[PDB]
Amino acid sequence: GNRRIRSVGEMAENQFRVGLVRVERAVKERLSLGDLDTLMPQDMINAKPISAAVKEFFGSSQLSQFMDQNNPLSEITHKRRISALGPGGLTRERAGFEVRDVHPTHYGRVCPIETPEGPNIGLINSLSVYAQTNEYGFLETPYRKVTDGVVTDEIHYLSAIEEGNYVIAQANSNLDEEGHFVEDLVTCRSKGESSLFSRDQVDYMDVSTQQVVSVGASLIPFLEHDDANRALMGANMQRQAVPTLRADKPLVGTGMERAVAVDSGVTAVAKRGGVVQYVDASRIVIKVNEDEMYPGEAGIDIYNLTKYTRSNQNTCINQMPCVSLGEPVERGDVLADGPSTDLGELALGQNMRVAFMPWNGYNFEDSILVSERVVQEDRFTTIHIQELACVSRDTKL
Amino acid sequence: EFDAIKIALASPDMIRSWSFGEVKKPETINYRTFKPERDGLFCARIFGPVKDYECLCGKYKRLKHRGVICEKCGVEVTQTKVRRERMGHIELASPTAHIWFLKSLPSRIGLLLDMPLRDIERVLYFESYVVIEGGMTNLERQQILTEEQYLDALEEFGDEFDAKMGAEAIQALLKSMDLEQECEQLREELNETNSETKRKKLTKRIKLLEAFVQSGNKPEWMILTVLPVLPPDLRPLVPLDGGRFATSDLNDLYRRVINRNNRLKRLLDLAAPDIIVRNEKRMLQEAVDALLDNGRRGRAITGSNKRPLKSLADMIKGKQGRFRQNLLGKRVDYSGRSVITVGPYLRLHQCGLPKKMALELFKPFIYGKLELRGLATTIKAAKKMVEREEAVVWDILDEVIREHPVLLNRAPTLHRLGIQAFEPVLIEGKAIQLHPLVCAAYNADFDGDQMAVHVPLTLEAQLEARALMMSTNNILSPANGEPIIVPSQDVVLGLYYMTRDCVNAKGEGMVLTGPKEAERLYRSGLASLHARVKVRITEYEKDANGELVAKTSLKDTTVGRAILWMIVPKGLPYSIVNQALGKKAISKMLNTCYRILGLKPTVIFADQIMYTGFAYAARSGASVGIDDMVIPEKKHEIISEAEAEVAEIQEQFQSGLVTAGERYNKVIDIWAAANDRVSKAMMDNLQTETVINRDGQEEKQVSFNSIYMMADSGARGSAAQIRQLAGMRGLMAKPDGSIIETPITANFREGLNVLQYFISTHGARKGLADTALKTANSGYLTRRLVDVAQDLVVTEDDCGTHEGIMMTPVIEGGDVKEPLRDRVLGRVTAEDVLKPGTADILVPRNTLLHEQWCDLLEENSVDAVKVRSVVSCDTDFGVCAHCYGRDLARGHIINKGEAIGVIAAQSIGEPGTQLTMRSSIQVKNKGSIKLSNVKSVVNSSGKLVITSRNTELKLIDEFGRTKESYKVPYGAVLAKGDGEQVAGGETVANWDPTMPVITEVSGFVRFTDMIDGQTITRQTDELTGLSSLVVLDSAERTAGGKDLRPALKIVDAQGNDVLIPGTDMPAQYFLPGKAIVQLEDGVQISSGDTLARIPQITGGLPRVADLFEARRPKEPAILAEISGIVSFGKETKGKRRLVITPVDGSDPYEEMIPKWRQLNVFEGERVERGDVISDGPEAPHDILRLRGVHAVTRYIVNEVQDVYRLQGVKINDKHIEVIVRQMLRKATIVNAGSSDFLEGEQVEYSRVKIANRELEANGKVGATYSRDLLGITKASLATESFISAASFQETTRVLTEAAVAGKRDELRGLKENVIVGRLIPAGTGYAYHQDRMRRRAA
Amino acid sequence: HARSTGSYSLVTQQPLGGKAQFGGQRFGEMEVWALEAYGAAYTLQEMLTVKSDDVNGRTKMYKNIVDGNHQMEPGMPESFNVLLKEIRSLGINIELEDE
Amino acid sequence: AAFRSVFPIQSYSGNSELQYVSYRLGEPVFDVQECQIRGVTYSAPLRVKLRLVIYEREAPEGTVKDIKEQEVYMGEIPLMTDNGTFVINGTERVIVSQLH
Amino acid sequence: ARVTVQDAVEKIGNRFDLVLVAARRARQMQVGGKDPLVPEENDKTTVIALREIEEGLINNQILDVRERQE
DNA sequence: GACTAAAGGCAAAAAAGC
DNA sequence: GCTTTTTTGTTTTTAGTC
Ligand SMILES: [Mg+2]
Ligand SMILES: [Zn+2]
Ligand SMILES: [Zn+2]
């Protein structure tokens, strides 16, 4: 309740206002000591200081980070990042132990798992899946209203401070058919602690079992069985995965794979429903449905898929048309698959056949064995794209 | 090329002798050409030519006149390296004063003159005049003057009035006065003086001047008159494009000062008036000030775009300074870096290398190998030949690889084994294949950690790498006592599976000829790996002097044990491998071998262990699955009971019977009890799962579950992890420290609620953050240990001293933690060891107790043998070999020369990673009761009650061994007596946790010598039900009433103040504040009856850090440093005074004693020499200064050992003690004779001065000093060598101090020798210097 | 990454850094402690004098390797004499008093 | 609102007042694809309409001339792509939220 | 070939003058060298000296005395 | 006579320019 | 990534007071 998130809009407004006042004092002085009626605003006003200030803020700062392109999950968790650093936060040397900790009010607002390790831990924690910002800048999370003993389907958004004087049930608590709890003494949490409360005492219920972990840690299967440290390790190495030339589906997943694949803009999604008319390895032509296309404009959709291009981590991006001729598509349907995805589902690595057994020490402590069969069939071989730039300057000679 | 460094000030004639010419003009280069001026700053005649073997005019062309001068250009035709070294000088018409001594905070000019620096600066920059006997009677030589006073005195005397100006006046005054009469007069002044503020300044001045006269430097030499010029190479001027230059900052100031000199010379060429003479002299003065140290006073840069220039000071110190950033931390070639992997087919002295890295590293050696064979012709030919990677290149590279060890080291080289050597083995790939076992030394897992490979070049480096660096020599860890080649994670489980025994398997119950048969039965699949066979074996024993006698028998064992016994060496008993060989055993295994057969059998045996363990772990198969983790069925039922009782406790709070705190404690306690019960149930279920029938009925035996195999064998995991996997994970605590009241009731195998997981999140985040932030503070600590203990080099073999007291095993209240066996092992005795048999000497003096003399101690029940310690040594800046003890890295005793301080620093710094950041006496054993500090009297019940607060009790075994120790507080009754044989489980003392105060004689209590109501208050409370007597303090009671220190008058039937008969003092005992007396008036009191009742560890890393720094605690426990009978003082505005009354000597002593905190000191306390007064933490300072030097040693070593044992880390006590010998490196002179009166300086220097003085000056008292300590932070600043001091802190100050004092550096350290580039005299360099002095300069 | 002998920085005669531009592995000082803790003095002398920051010894050592030798220069490096000259420049008399 | 913070502009004593009227966003000069290809910011021009009003000197507040400068160029404002990210020169850079 | 110096330690135990005399031996075995006293199997002089410790007639104290012989 | 509290200076650190 | 500038934590000296 005492910490507020500033998004790009607020810093943009602040820098714009700074440049505005900086140019405005000068133009006010010039107008006061200059012409009175025979002058135009355009020549006396200036634009270069404002443009320079805003461009410098956008292109050079400790908070305008460098986008990572090695993985759709990497970019989604980078766009969903919350940082306590930058011009207005706190430094690494003067950061106390207590501001690097999980407060009991992070349940449903900030992921307690995904967090970079090393010098800056607990400062760059990301926010959960259902967390959304408030009008004043506070963090707000969904909940399900319970009137007396029945859960109302209508959602209700709660801020941080408002949660303090309430009692909130748990999603895993069973409901019989219309919210009637199986036990009249249901578990709950009221003020930074957990206890057991009566059925009639509860009034709010959490929406689901997923608003605790972020997107980066919600695709680890069977997360409720492994240690928190190992969960963090898995989340990080899942973030840092590199795409293969031919992604394969995960045999065991979570169901958020489609959401992460389609919400991110890497993959091509059908903007308007219709039927396909001509497929190609580089472009897609879609015959839009007659009843859907508005009158006046009677054209058809064109999707110009991108090809091998240099990325911030030198990995390759190439969309693959995952459709055929003469098959219907819907609005918001997946038409092409980018890197590390297939059929509109996230796919980061490969599903190997593994056995747990010591073997002559070649897997001594953490090392791994690989059969020569997998390197025959190139199941893990990757493609990297490098840029070489040569400039032609002019010296004195 | 040398072995000592002497630094002192320079004389003008010798400065000119350094020079080779005189510079006239600053034109470094002429226009329209590129020839430096023949008479300018860059002068060939002064410095040298810019062309090799050629003169400026080039009439002598590098064939006829090498080394001889040229007629046109007066420079010897030679190489350019002389230009690098040749230097010149500049003669100053007006002498100037050096500025550092002016700018130093301890101003040497001011200290030697006894005037401040403000007036000196004014007379130096020509703002005030200086009198030089202007008048014989009016004023003196050491007064300042002004222009108006000068004119007034000029008219006054004129003829005798002389007063010069500036630096020439300063140096004239400095030279015209002597220093002898000054030194004697100052010695007499300090001899008869009273003040202390000026006493320190006067002592500093007299020391400075007595060193100055001894230094041989004349004071007037400090005021320089000729300035040397740096050789031109240090101020390069590269010609940039269009005739431009780099604009060296040195050349700018050189031009400025030379222009000032030329202008002054022109000014004095026509006898200019003094009005403009002063201005020019002043300008030259700031010119030389700027050149000598720019920006210190006036910041007169005037030569840049508003930025300072580097004149001299910027290139002495600073990070941009080259000293500790260019000889401490730097780049290096002939190295590579890459990821690691596991090569489980290599020997201990082998590491893999990728072919590409191998060829890249060894290409310079390839060319030499190639050109020798004649395949190539030129370097280009060899390079293009190896570029194609032909056939011969691989075989010649494999030839040169065979004998050329390479050094591997991880990035964080925490301790001595960070850098190891190996013989390379060429393989394909791009990873450093490493031996598994050695990876325990590096502490390097295989999750992507990188290592770097280096390569020695010379024969010296390679030979020393083979001798020392190689892993086969560094078997034993230098830390405490144990090998680093203990079998690692995977192999241990393989060996554990090798040696087990089921109750029934294929091929059991028969017999085999020997271990060879067991191999064939198992390999052919006819018998199980573990069975119950009876095999016949033959082994050997070392009973004879090197002769292995053989014996054979029929030892019942299992099949696998014979397979294991196949690979063990000759001389080991078979009893070692009968038990189920876990993890700690195998290490002990190796230890046994290391102490019977040597080194090569041990290393080959360890290699065989690794191979067999890997092979039979692969062949066995050990997987983990859901069916392998069994959940105890009772566990669920258990929670119900807990839940039920939890609800019960809730009802207790519901009715108000219990409050919040006690309910919380009860619920957490019952939950912990439930956790204990479920953990025990799960352990019982796992341990005995297996039930296999053997010919009918079913029999139970140890389970073969994989999880239990991992847990029991010690390969990985422990009881905690297995408990978490199946049983309760355990109740977690909030990060602030509070423990939550709802424990997690589910294990990892079962599901976890979202709250339970969320609650368990921040429990691990705190630990992860602590580990992440611990890599800086802990490692930094090692630095503060390296600098203080940098040298500590063993120099000579034996000194002959025999000091040291009471090296005994430590008892910590309960059972003994470590015996005498490991505490004294590795040390050499000094006193003769007396067997407890009335002079039947067992171990002679001056013998190394390795194992055999240790083997002679357990049967004699010896418990107190003192050995010679490092602190009790009296050498010169070193330690004796026969005093440090046996070296821990190798089996034999310490060698000669090798460093110990760095070893100790690294050994104490390594366990930092495993070091975290944030009423009655019960007997447990059987033996006799003994009491130390025997001071007790018979009580009213006939038992014993003590009157001395510092009494301690110890249980003694029937053989005289001490097995228990218990501090006995004041007023504690005794339930037994000394010498009574009492077993365990019987209390012997009882005391209240209020402290009662008890009398000593029988009789009535005539309550006199107190004021009723004022001192004693009739507190007729309803609880006690009587008018109690409360002796309130001065603040609690009336100030006037509390003005007599009331004492109860215990009387006999006569009603008189009966005394302790004739000996000490009457029965009047001064009752302290709040002396709660339940007696009313005149109640009969027997001897030993109560009188009244007084109503009376941080984290490991901070504890170590502030213990080594010797920081004073919050409340230092005051101590009585004098004997006699203690008394009570008076009362003041603050802490009450407390006077002591020793029975002899200088008795009138008192001190400032706080009264709010507890003071367990009374009038009737016959205190002794070195007994504590108050309670609480004690700083090492008082302990060192009052109760002996050995007392501080026994304190901090015990504290740090307790900390490390709490952290589960054990280290040897030699490492902790040696830095102590370096920590106590200073002393304070009490009696004069060597220093002046109180010069706190090196204790070793004073001791060696006194020892030689007594030989010649027999009778002189010398100096009865007191050896005082100093924190490591302060100890690093007081280094004897000035190079180490100048390395990092205040380089300008220490350089000036060494220059004026004529300091001589013998180069006794290691960092200082690294600084100057000479070979370090710690390792093989020490033997080089000793052999260097023996042959040459003998 | 691996490096034997390549280019050097202009300001200081040290090998380059990083994997690119044919850099050299960094040699800190904790391993200086770890290596002086052994009996190692010759290796320390080599790898702080001739391997890293020398120019006369560096070129000579390379030429002294190819011709079948592995012999160093058993004397004080010129990197120490210059320091001496520095101390001799200010006002100070510094000398190798004992030889 | 950012404009409205410094919306009034008033001279020293010349009775000159500069005020904001309206603004419009220009179309981006180059699309995102060529911005990555060429190396330019996918930005938009800023156009504003400024009104300068002048009163008679040493007279009450009566307007004389209204100078309406429309579409005044106030530099370039970088634009967010449809995927929720910004490109500065050739590489996409996203600005993350800050917790203060 | 030879990797350990246990034979040197057990009778001539010292790690410093031993390597110094081994270096003195090897330096003039390399340049101006003569035939060794033991058979060679593709080794350089950086390991031949240590093997000469095993034969007994070459040892750390022997070289110091042998310095007078030269 | 010694303790308390004030500033100058010294050294390490984040930031910005090259 | 290398190097200089300004800023803040640690150290030291001196005027005022119990
Ligand atoms: Mg690895
Ligand atoms: Zn000439
Ligand atoms: Zn000694």
From Swiss-Prot, chain A:
Co-administration of salinamide and rifampicin or salinamide and myxopyronin suppresses the emergence of resistance to both antibiotics. It comes from the Bacteria. Acetylated on several lysine residues in the presence of glucose. Changing I113S: Resistant to antibiotics salinamide A and B. Changing I121S: Resistant to antibiotics salinamide A and B. Changing E365K: Disrupts the enzyme's active center. The RNAP catalytic core consists of 2 alpha, 1 beta, 1 beta' and 1 omega subunit. When a sigma factor is associated with the core the holoenzyme is formed, which can initiate transcription. The rRNA transcription and antitermination complex (rrnTAC) consists of RNAP, NusA, NusB, NusE (rpsJ), NusG, SubB, ribosomal protein S4, DNA and precursor rRNA; S4 is more flexible than other subunits. In pull-down experiments interacts with CedA. (Microbial infection) Interacts (via flap domain) with Escherichia phage lambda antitermination protein Q; this interaction renders bacterial RNAP resistant to transcription pausing and allows it to read through termination signals. Belongs to the RNA polymerase beta chain family. DNA-dependent RNA polymerase (RNAP) catalyzes the transcription of DNA into RNA using the four ribonucleoside triphosphates as substrates. Resistance to the antibiotics salinamide A, salinamide B, rifampicin, streptolydigin, CBR703, myxopyronin, and lipiarmycin can result from mutations in this protein. This is DNA-directed RNA polymerase subunit beta. It comes from Escherichia coli (strain K12).
UniProtKB/Swiss-Prot annotation, chain B:
Zn(2+) 2 binds at C799, C873, C880, C883. Mg(2+) binds at D445, D447, D449. Keywords: Acetylation, DNA-directed RNA polymerase, Magnesium, Metal-binding, Nucleotidyltransferase, Transcription, Transferase, Zinc. It is an enzyme of class 2 (transferase). Binds 1 Mg(2+) ion per subunit. Binds 2 Zn(2+) ions per subunit. It catalyses: RNA(n) + a ribonucleoside 5'-triphosphate = RNA(n+1) + diphosphate. GO terms for molecular function: DNA binding; DNA-directed RNA polymerase activity; magnesium ion binding; zinc ion binding. DNA-dependent RNA polymerase catalyzes the transcription of DNA into RNA using the four ribonucleoside triphosphates as substrates. This is DNA-directed RNA polymerase subunit beta'. It comes from Escherichia coli O157:H7.
UniProtKB/Swiss-Prot annotation, chain E:
Keywords: DNA-directed RNA polymerase, Nucleotidyltransferase, Transcription, Transferase. The RNAP catalytic core consists of 2 alpha, 1 beta, 1 beta' and 1 omega subunit. When a sigma factor is associated with the core the holoenzyme is formed, which can initiate transcription. The rRNA transcription and antitermination complex (rrnTAC) consists of RNAP, NusA, NusB, NusE (rpsJ), NusG, SubB, ribosomal protein S4, DNA and precursor rRNA; S4 is more flexible than other subunits. Transmembrane segments: none annotated. Its EC number is 2.7.7.6. GO terms for biological process: bacterial-type flagellum assembly; bacterial-type flagellum-dependent cell motility; cell motility; cellular response to cell envelope stress; DNA-templated transcription initiation; intracellular iron ion homeostasis; nitrate assimilation; protein-containing complex assembly. This is DNA-directed RNA polymerase subunit omega. Belongs to the RNA polymerase subunit omega family. It is an enzyme of class 2 (transferase). GO terms for cellular component: cytosol; cytosolic DNA-directed RNA polymerase complex; RNA polymerase complex; transcription elongation factor complex. GO terms for molecular function: bacterial-type RNA polymerase core enzyme binding; DNA binding; DNA-directed RNA polymerase activity. The keyword Nucleotidyltransferase applies. Promotes RNA polymerase (RNAP) assembly. Latches the N- and C-terminal regions of the beta' subunit thereby facilitating its interaction with the beta and alpha subunits. It catalyses: RNA(n) + a ribonucleoside 5'-triphosphate = RNA(n+1) + diphosphate.
